[PDB]
Symmetry: C3
């Protein structure tokens, strides 16, 4: 199978500059080379150049609407393109608002896809419920069919078409949900495993249930959108919104290993790695290294080890 890396060095979805450096840090750490050592064919599409929209006045509270909307329209085109040729898209993030274009483009080719969202946050604030106008905390609002027309149209997002329904998404790692977002997920009946369900069930049973929930009836392509703050700050400190009590390095790897095993991974996002937020170089190294490890895991690297087929090592 073929893999195509797409860098999305974008940061206007939130106030902290730095996430745009995310793709560079991950490549610097050898992500592309290490992926070529796996059984997959890898092609690096490079980083997308995003045109800045001058005079991007805020829409009510929403900041940089046009710049975010345009960068995402462009990313959706690119992803739809690689998906069309039958390759697996891997988006290297800047902030999580880029999931709008990544999932939109992916859905144009695979309308029946399901989403596994690993994050400490639901990122489902609508333009009306946000306390901040930050779009990195609103991606899912723009993608849900059930949320269509529940918020005013935003400048730069008219090209977006709600592609997935509440039944096609599963959250894992939740521990920082605003009152409004909580209201939304409860009202829409969205399946989720907050840190309390992970604690109660154990990550092994959590994965069992998300698969029987999303793939029980029909086997369909999987889009894994992975926000690095889903893991505890001890493992991924270099992020914009760290929340204590998260997933461990082990649980994160367990999630990716199980997803690899389904044979259905179709799209992947590695978001919110911000190199400038590390208090010490080691903190940045720690964050980048685990992001790389999670990516390699999604493509076959197992902790029990790997050996090339047909090679008699004796």
């Amino acid at each position: 199978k073929p893999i195509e890396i797409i860098g999305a060095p974008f940061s206007k979805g939130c106030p902290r500059g730095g996430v745009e450096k995310g793709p560079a840090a991950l490549r610097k750490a050898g992500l592309v080379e290490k992926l070529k050592e796996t059984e997959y064919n890898v092609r690096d599409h490079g980083d997308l150049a995003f045109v800045d929209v001058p005079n991007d006045s805020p829409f009510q509270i929403v900041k940089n609407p046009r710049s975010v909307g345009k960068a995402n329209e462009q990313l959706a085109a690119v992803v739809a393109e690689t998906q069309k040729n039958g390759t697996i898209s891997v988006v290297l993030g800047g902030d999580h608002s880029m999931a709008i274009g990544s999932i939109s483009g992916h859905a144009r080719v695979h309308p029946d896809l399901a989403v596994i969202w690993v994050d400490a946050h639901t990122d489902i604030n609508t333009p009306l419920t946000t306390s901040s106008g930050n779009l990195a905390g609103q991606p899912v609002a723009f993608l849900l069919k059930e949320l269509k027309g529940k918020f005013p149209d935003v400048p730069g997002f008219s090209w977006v078409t709600p592609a997935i329904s509440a039944k096609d998404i599963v959250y894992i790692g939740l521990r920082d949900v605003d009152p409004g977002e909580h209201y939304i997920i409860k009202t829409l009946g969205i399946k989720y495993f907050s840190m309390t369900e992970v604690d109660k069930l154990g990550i092994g049973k959590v994965m069992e249930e998300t698969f029987s929930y999303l793939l029980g009836r029909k086997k369909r392509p999987i889009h894994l959108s992975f926000d690095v703050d889903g893991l505890d700050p001890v493992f991924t400190p270099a992020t914009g919104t760290p929340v204590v009590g998260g997933l461990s390095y082990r649980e994160g790897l367990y999630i990716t290993e199980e997803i690899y095993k389904t044979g259905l991974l179709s799209g992947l996002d590695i978001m919110e790695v911000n190199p400038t937020l590390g208090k010490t170089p080691e903190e940045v190294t720690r964050t980048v290294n685990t992001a790389v490890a999670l990516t390699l895991s999604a493509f076959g690297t197992k902790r029990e080890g790997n050996h090339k087929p047909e090679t008699d090592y004796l």
Copy 2:
């Protein structure tokens, strides 16, 4: 329901000064204000002023018997008072010996209560088995009916009446038990979940079983006495007796979330937070923040999020 915060800035139960500053550190962190944001009515009773008993000679090995006994008699009066008015008492600790007064006063109003003791220690040394005369390590000995008359009467504790039996207490987090204490809990048949049972069963099943054990027959008020050293030193380093290999931040929260869900929480103790034992300011901040988080969790704050009823956020 109503909540009444009662500060017990007391430290004579152990040799390390500093735990008396516990209540102040917790209030400083906004504990009271954060509690008012929950669905509960909060009333801060302030800190109790404890009269120091001059010439408090040790009783054999037991140190400061009269001062500890008197401070606890006074606390028991206060707690009995608030319990009588039907409010939930929350004692902010200095050392764990204050559980004597806290549980005694609580039992006067709710004689059928059950106790969930979260601690790395059993704190059940009798005045005869202690290696040190420290009373913070003997609370439970004074409260058990089955231990009545098994140790000489101590100066200052004649007002105490053993209120609970071995059948009404469950320990969680044990990992540092003296030979004598171990002998006692085995002989008396006290239910406990040491770190090895937590490791074996997972915190989810541990809570299931402590509830079926204490509430299986009759639903009764629950008193949760929480020693902050029950959690691993990595989360609560600012305590007098830290022991490695404890409960994680996540498991601690899981415990409080489950207790909140029973709807039976009646009394709560947040003990052993000693601000002067942090090696760095951050260590104190870390300890205070998790103590606050545990308290809020006992009163409804969920990791999956919270939203106010009747408020249509759309």
Copy 3:
């Protein structure tokens, strides 16, 4: 029962000097004295003096073959000796290549023994598959019957006789396996629990299954070879090859407590503690303390506590 401590201050099995100081650091921490407090009879055999083989040229890639082979022949003699007298051998390590002599000598007296290998590594590289000539990463290759004649005879190891088969060993904690090693364990059908199986099953079920697999048919002596890097670097940082995402302090203790409970522990290795690799004195202290705790746990120390029989503490 009797315990005999045997120090193996050896480091030629790997490039990083320092592991030879392992035994001294462990004794310095009071290992021997603390063991005497248990129900066992303890005898310290002291440290073995290893004769250095001059002009030890490398065998192809393999470094210090003769020195490693000789030190192991000597250790095997000593262990066979103590095993013969019916005592439990406890080898305090330098590097893991010493498991060759420890297990070989043990098997001379107890041919039906089974091995529980706790390590982040399989240490099963053959002289032909190693990327480095380091012997600490090849112990198991020399011990497996199924690997006999699959690699050239090495200078200094002609005295070795493959004592155990693929059916008698179980790995726990794997997370860093070379392609060749992975090929070997898959081809030979060796039972293992990598960190992913520990994540999926939980340490409780992992122990259940390793016991039903190794002791289901016949109860036999157990040899526990414990590489300290099996635990996460946060608990045992002072080792030569730390790998993130390992067993926790709690899981490590759970393993030893369950092994103690079988009543079948016959041989124990505490390997790879390297005092010179701690970045701070506290890191070395942390590493030595958990190694001591694991050893005491193998011989009865429980987290729920211990009390001496026939002693009425009341």
